Amino acid sequence: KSYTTPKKNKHKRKKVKLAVLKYYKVDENGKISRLRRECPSDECGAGVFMASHFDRHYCGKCCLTYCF
Amino acid sequence: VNTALQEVLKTALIHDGLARGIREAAKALDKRQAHLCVLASNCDEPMYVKLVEALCAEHQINLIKVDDNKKLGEWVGLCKIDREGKPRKVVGCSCVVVKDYGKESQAKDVIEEYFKC
């Protein structure tokens, strides 16, 4: 129903282009480097990773938010 | 060989022991519960090829090369629409990390001695 008040919108979610290839760094030698943080909980052993924010690091589901 | 890969992908499809895609495949490879790994080479891979080779060159990880993404995407059962003959549209899967539980096949043995040779 079109009313004179403005109409809100659902949050469209911004699409990233190959983010997993940004986590693992491959140099010219035989080594693998981890740029962002890892997960220390017992639910997720080594699988999911944390957010790279400007003042904290947010877990995917374990909510282990460590702020600097 | 390729029919052995087709049989093991069909077995993984009917036993649900498979990790398609790239993200949960990397999850499974870093989970260290992996048996075989595949890759379709010579595609549009500016850096995904060197990422996936440095990922699969860790330990106990094998390799099988496919000409294009369209063929192993048909063997994995990714997109099955209008199955009366040829499918409608099948999208290509890059890599497959597979768990094997029903390992009772001659094709499994011949592909295993192909890896070990």
CB-based contacts of B96: which residues, under 8 Å, 6+ apart?
A: B9, B18, B19, B20, B25, B37, B38, B72, B76
Retrieve residue B69's tokens.
Answer: 């993404």
Q: How many CA atoms within 13 Å lie on the side-chain side of A47?
A: 16
> Residues B43-59, buried b or exposed e (16+ Cβ, 10 A)?
eeeeebeebbebbbeee
Residue B109 near residue B115 (C-beta atoms within 8 A): no
Retrieve residue B28's tokens.
Answer: 């499974």
The Cα B116–Cα B110 span in angstroms is 10
**CA torsion sign, A43 to A59 to B57 to B72?**
positive
The Cα A26–Cα B55 span in angstroms is 9
Give the method of determination. cryo-EM
CA distances from B40 to A53, B69, B75, B83, B96 (A): 35, 6, 13, 24, 10
Q: How much is the CA Rg of chain B, to the nearest whole Å?
A: 14
Report CB contact under 8 Å: B54, A24.
yes
Residues of A in contact with B61 (CB under 8 A): none
The Cα B24–Cα B10 span in angstroms is 19
Residue B31 touches partner A, C-beta closer than 8 Å = yes
Strands B18-19 and A56-57: unpaired
B40 DSSP assignment: E
Residue A47 near residue A34 (C-beta atoms within 8 A): no
**CA torsion sign, B12 to B65 to B110 to B61?**
negative
**CA torsion sign, A30 to A26 to B51 to B22?**
positive
Residue A26 touches partner B, C-beta closer than 8 Å = yes
Within 10 Å of residue A26's Cβ, how many Cβ atoms?
A: 18
Strand partners, B66: B40
Q: How many CA atoms within 13 Å lie on the side-chain side of B87?
A: 13
Report CB contact under 8 Å: A21, B51.
yes
- A22, A24, A36, A44, best to mutate vs chain B, most B CBs in 10 Å: A24
Q: How much is the CA Rg of chain A, to the nearest whole Å?
A: 18
Of B47, B57, B58, the CB nearest to A21: B47
Amino acid type, B32: R
Residue A66 touches partner B, C-beta closer than 8 Å = no
The stretches of chain B forming alpha helices (DSSP H) are 2-15, 23-30, 48-56, 69-76, 106-116
* Number of residues that this document lists for chain B: 117
Closest chain A residue by Cα to residue B51: A26
